[PDB]
Amino acid sequence: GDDFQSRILDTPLQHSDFFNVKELFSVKSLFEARVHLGHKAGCRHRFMEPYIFGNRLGQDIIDLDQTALNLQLALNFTAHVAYRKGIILFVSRNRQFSHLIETTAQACGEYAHTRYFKGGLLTNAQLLFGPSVRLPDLIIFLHTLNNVFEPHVAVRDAAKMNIPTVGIVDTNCNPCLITYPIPGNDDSPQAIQLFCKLFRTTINRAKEKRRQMEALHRLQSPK
């Protein structure tokens, strides 16, 4: 009874890669999708210089070795959150990828907000949605900037509500408030398409893993 619930929720945290997210991606796979391409040196943010491999003739290059480490942590965290039945909200304001990100969220079983973000959505949610509205347990920022080249309002507002954020941060982005930054290209369709696939497979695996874990432990109770 109590042991079974403890087994479902406490066993996954005893393994470094319980969901085996390492196999989903590789440095070569990230390099095919152009995840190492950054903005020009003029557009560089000071807090991104740790993640930049160098400047290839004006174009900053993003170290895909750090990206693999950071992406591993971000995908693992996104899986445990999905495993525990937490709410995940995908957030972006890039209009080229608005439909793709809404289709990804629907496939995963999660939520997407690709439209204009209303002031107070998270800090004043009760007024907007209702008295007992449950806020997201994790926000994945495929894009952390709005269309005026400023931080998306939900980056600061998610920190105010103590919501962890998994965000894709490029050379011009500010990762300081992103809990799990993933340094990489956010503009190329092939880069965004790869990230959307990784987040969707990871979330579906964790949800499937929970179902199987529940059946095994549940079956043991009669058996």
Binding site: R46, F77, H80, R84, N162, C176
Partner: protein, 136 residues
Amino acid sequence: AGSRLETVGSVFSRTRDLMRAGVLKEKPLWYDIYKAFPPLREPVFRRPRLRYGKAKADIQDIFYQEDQIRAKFFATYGSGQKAFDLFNPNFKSTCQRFVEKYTELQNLGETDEEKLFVETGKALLAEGIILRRVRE
């Protein structure tokens, strides 16, 4: 009751502190996960500052040794009349073949850059590549 102070500490440190005080009675579901698999860096606020005086960034300009050869090829012959295909991961351009042959001759032991530049042109001419020495 919470700590909507996103400039002091981090989401995890503020959640740890609120529970110690006695205000937050139930752990968030993401808390235990963060404790077991934290991020590499703590997500704490920092005000971006500008550099002044003689402070400079530390970004290495990416220049391989082939670039010395490639620069000469573009100055002497320009870009190959064949168009670059940047979708083929194993594409070999006319310039990259020039640099592959130039390297082979240099392995043999030729020490003169002038010798390696004119000999490579002759070898590619035998291959049939159309190299136009366009000064224009």
